[PDB]
């Protein structure tokens, strides 16, 4: 009877960064997932594990969106088996993943004259990402063997690192937002189906 | 577009002082972190000093920490040197450098500004 607040996914006034991955689950709803899928809004609309033609016949016990802002360059990184920063450092997608990644061209909201640098990725961790972690430490990362604690060498970084989202840059180096659903089959009821 | 001019330097003496300024181009300074680099004659790049984004902390070689301080004039666009208890294998060629990442259309590597501290 309720159907499922996907406006309030796709259609938020502000996006995270990358490195800190918004999340929202949702349940105890009706969801019609060709009408977005069928929308000509998206540049990507890509699934695994699941085809997106028979999305409606499925039904699960709940369904996660993560959303969050990055390159265009790197969509190809929110997928199993991928690697590069935003795949080991900021968003790991499981090699089982069952679900779909949602990504469209953003430079119209996320860049600025003179260039907008709100929007930040994780450059250094020291070790990659398990499925679905999220990491918003600050701290000073140590490269090499000369530590950094206390007064600090030049081999000690900031772990973040700014987008320079320009206008007139090129496609892949423009902001996409993305939206991943993960579709969580349980051993609980169903509370999120077609219509 | 984006460019990176190194300014100042020359000859000082042992114990002497000395400024080098990084103008940049294209960009602004305070968004990634900027780094000094030296090479001294028949030796590797050194990392000198560090100021991070945004007032993140700033970072010193132990060869050059107390004496050495690293800046940023947001206002000229501008990372500043300033050198002081000078010693003589202090002397090499000074670079400056944008930890971009990438981040920017850049034609990434490349002139540099020469320093020399005498004996006395
Ligand atoms: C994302 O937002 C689009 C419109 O933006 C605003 O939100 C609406 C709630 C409404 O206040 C509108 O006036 C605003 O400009 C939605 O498209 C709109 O959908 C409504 C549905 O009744 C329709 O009346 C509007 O004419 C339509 N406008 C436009 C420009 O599309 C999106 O809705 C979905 O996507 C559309 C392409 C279309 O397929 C629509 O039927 C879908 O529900 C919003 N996305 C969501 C809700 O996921």
């Known amino acids: 009877t309720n159907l499922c607040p996907f406006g309030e996914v796709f259609n938020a006034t502000?996006?995270?960064?990358?490195?800190?991955?918004?999340?929202?689950?949702?349940?105890?709803?009706?969801?019609?997932?060709?009408?977005?899928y069928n929308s000509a809004s998206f540049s990507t609309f890509k699934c695994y594990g699941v085809s997106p033609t028979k999305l409606n016949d499925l039904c699960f016990t709940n369904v996660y969106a993560d959303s969050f802002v990055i390159r265009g360059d790197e969509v190809r990184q929110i997928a199993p088996g991928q690697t590069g920063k935003i795949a080991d450092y900021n968003y790991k997608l499981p090699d089982d993943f069952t679900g779909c990644v949602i990504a469209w061209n953003s430079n119209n909201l996320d860049s600025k004259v003179?260039?907008?640098?709100?929007?930040?990725?994780?450059?250094?961790?020291?070790?990659?990402?398990?499925?679905?972690?999220?990491?918003?430490?600050?701290?000073?990362?140590?490269?090499?063997?000369?530590?950094?604690?206390?007064?600090?060498?030049?081999?000690?970084?900031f772990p973040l690192q700014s987008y320079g989202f320009q206008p007139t840059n090129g496609v892949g180096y423009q902001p996409y937002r993305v939206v991943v659903l993960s579709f969580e089959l349980l051993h609980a009821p169903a509370t999120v189906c077609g219509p | 577009q984006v460019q990176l001019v190194e300014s100042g330097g020359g000859l000082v003496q042992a114990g002497g002082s000395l400024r080098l300024s990084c103008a940049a181009?294209?960009?602004?300074?305070?968004?990634?972190?900027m780094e000094w680099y030296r090479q001294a004659p028949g030796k590797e790049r050194e990392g000198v000093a560090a100021i991070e984004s945004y007032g993140h902390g700033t970072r010193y070689a132990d060869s050059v920490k107390g004496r050495?301080?690293?800046?940023?004039?947001?206002?000229?666009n501008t990372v500043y040197l300033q050198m002081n208890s000078l010693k003589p294998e202090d002397t090499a060629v000074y670079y400056c450098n944008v930890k971009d990442d990438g981040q920017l259309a850049y034609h990434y590597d490349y002139q540099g500004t020469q320093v020399t501290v005498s004996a006395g």
């Open chain 2, 25 to 33: 181009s294209g960009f602004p300074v305070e968004v990634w972190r």
């Open chain 1, 114 to 157: 003179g260039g907008n640098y709100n929007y930040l990725y994780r450059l250094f961790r020291k070790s990659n990402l398990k499925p679905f972690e999220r990491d918003i430490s600050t701290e000073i990362y140590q490269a090499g063997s000369t530590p950094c604690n206390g007064v600090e060498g030049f081999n000690c970084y």
């Open chain 2, 68 to 76: 050495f301080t690293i800046s940023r004039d947001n206002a000229k």
């Open chain 1, 14 to 36: 502000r996006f995270a960064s990358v490195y800190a991955w918004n999340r929202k689950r949702i349940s105890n709803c009706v969801a019609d997932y060709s009408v977005l």
